[PDB]
RNA sequence: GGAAACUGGGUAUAGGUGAAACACACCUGUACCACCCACGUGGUGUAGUGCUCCUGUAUUGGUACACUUGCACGCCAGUUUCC
């Protein structure tokens, strides 16, 4: 068969000083063939503990392997701001080799209510044939949001992608464009575009609208 | 350091295709460590993919691989390959390279990654993108919160970079993760947040460089026309 | 090539070591099996010589001629050094 990495939790919110422990399962037997791994953004990953629980050289010291059985668990004894990252786990007691899912572990803050900017069409861009209706929230924290687009009213779905920032590095907030997607042809046919925001600082939804063809 | 990988020879690949990535070595001899692939796809998690045994030139390929993709060494040129074949979107990720370490210290763990190159398996034809401007509200606020940015569409393959005032502006600039859309091509926006009491008078652009297309793309971003 | 050290029946298998997951190399265990004996908690390259020891064939105690046990060289094969 092949071997199976299942590593709790898959995300981990925690303050700086917090000791924290990630959990990595094994569907058969490793012996101590595991090795834990840190990756941050943009960058190749670095490793942090080799067979079950020895300090790759260099590795601070807060950084600490453990095993039980078939259960390994990562420790760190206090968080450094520089130790925000996701963590990887591996084995290689056999071929092929398994990488667990990573936990990426992120700033617990206290909620930030998102500031709502919405921004119509360039018309360059409808000189295309495209419209492209994009809306801001911005430095909101948690980082679950809600964001529908009312167009006339009419909610609408399946038209509009989206993307987050990582977690800022100053504020330590999330930020949010939704961009609803129409054609020139039918963007024309309406006039009232709005953007309605749900989120854990918001008392009530908030909506940013505007009116095709004002100023 | 001292001890580098370097892999080249990732891009862009339609279905069915065949590239050949290389991982070439500096400052130790590859014959005498294992050698391995890992890829990443975006946004995804890790995924070892093949090796090669020192001394006995053993290979092996995860599951998901086999049969598609051969790894190979060559000691003269002190380079590893991975020739892949048959390739499928799915296969759309960075493809690290990396060494086990030396069994007395750091066990079997990988101590040493390439830079990672990137594999974009898609059909579409490279393509620069288009710039439109995220101009401020004419509402925005009386007092000095406003918020402004690029629209950066159609764009193949990844990945663009984004500044403004070449580089000038930094704080309270967030430039979003791309999104592949469903043409294809990708498209991201970037914004930035700014006093009003500034609109009046100073000038944002934002600076674009698409790299695989050679496309370089300012545009300035005013408020809106009628807004005094 | 020169000399320096070791090593020595078969198949498996566990562990170690060599820059070493497998392979290859080496080292150490284990299990089993094939053979020698004088039959063991035994032994194990060798149709060689010498001493030895066991068992015979007997002949002219002596002597041959075998068989066996051990020891020492030699020879063979492998390994590791060092020029």
């Known amino acids: 068969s092949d071997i199976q990495m299942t590593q709790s939790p898959s995300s981990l919110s925690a303050s700086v000083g917090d000791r924290v422990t990630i959990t990595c399962r094994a569907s058969?037997?490793?012996?101590?063939?595991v090795a834990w791994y840190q990756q941050k953004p943009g960058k190749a990953p670095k490793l942090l503990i080799y067979?079950?629980?020895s300090l790759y050289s260099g590795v601070p010291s807060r950084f600490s392997g453990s095993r039980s059985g078939t259960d390994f668990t990562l420790t760190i004894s206090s968080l450094q701001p520089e130790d925000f990252a996701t963590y990887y786990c591996?084995?290689?007691?056999?071929?092929?080799?398994?990488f667990g899912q990573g936990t990426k572990v992120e700033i617990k803050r206290t909620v930030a209510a998102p500031s709502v900017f919405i921004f119509p069409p360039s018309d360059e861009q409808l000189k295309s044939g495209t419209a492209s209706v994009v809306c801001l929230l911005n430095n909101f924290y948690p980082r679950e949001a809600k964001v529908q687009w009312k167009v006339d009213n009419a909610l609408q779905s399946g038209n509009s992608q989206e993307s987050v920032t990582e977690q800022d590095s100053k504020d330590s907030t999330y930020s949010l464009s939704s961009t609803l997607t129409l054609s020139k042809a039918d963007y024309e046919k309406h006039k009232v575009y709005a953007c309605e925001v749900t989120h854990q600082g918001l008392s009530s939804p908030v909506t940013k609208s505007f009116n095709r063809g004002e100023c | 350091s001292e001890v580098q990988l370097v892999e080249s020879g990732g891009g862009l690949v339609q279905p069915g295709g065949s590239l050949r990535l290389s991982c070439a070595a500096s400052?130790?001899?590859?014959?005498?460590?294992?050698i391995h692939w890992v890829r990443q796809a975006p946004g995804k998690g890790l995924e070892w993919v093949a090796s090669?045994?020192?001394?006995?030139?053993?290979?092996y390929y995860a599951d998901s691989v086999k049969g598609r993709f051969t790894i190979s060494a060559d000691t003269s040129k002190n380079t590893a390959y991975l020739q892949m074949n048959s390739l499928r979107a799915e296969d759309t990720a960075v493809y690290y390279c990396?060494?086990?370490?030396?069994?007395?210290?750091?066990?079997?763990?990988?101590?040493?990654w390439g830079q990672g190159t990137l594999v974009t398996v898609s059909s579409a034809s490279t393509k620069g993108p288009s710039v439109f401007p995220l101009a401020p509200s004419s509402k925005s606020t009386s007092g000095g919160t406003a918020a402004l940015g690029c629209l950066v569409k159609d764009y193949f393959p990844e990945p663009v970079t984004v500044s403004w005032n070449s580089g000038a502006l930094t704080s309270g600039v967030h430039t979003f993760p791309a999104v592949l859309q469903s043409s294809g091509l990708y498209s991201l926006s970037s914004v930035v947040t700014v006093p009003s009491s500034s609109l009046g008078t100073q000038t944002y652009i934002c600076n674009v460089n698409h790299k695989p297309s050679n496309t370089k793309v300012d545009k300035k971003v005013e408020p809106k026309s009628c807004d005094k």
């Open positions: 400052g130790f001899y590859i014959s005498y460590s294992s």
């Open positions: 090669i045994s020192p001394y006995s030139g053993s290979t």
């Open positions: 058969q037997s490793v012996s101590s063939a």
């Open positions: 591996q084995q290689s007691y056999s071929f092929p080799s398994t």
């Open positions: 990396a060494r086990q370490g030396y069994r007395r210290r750091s066990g079997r763990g990988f101590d040493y």
């Open positions: 067979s079950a629980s």
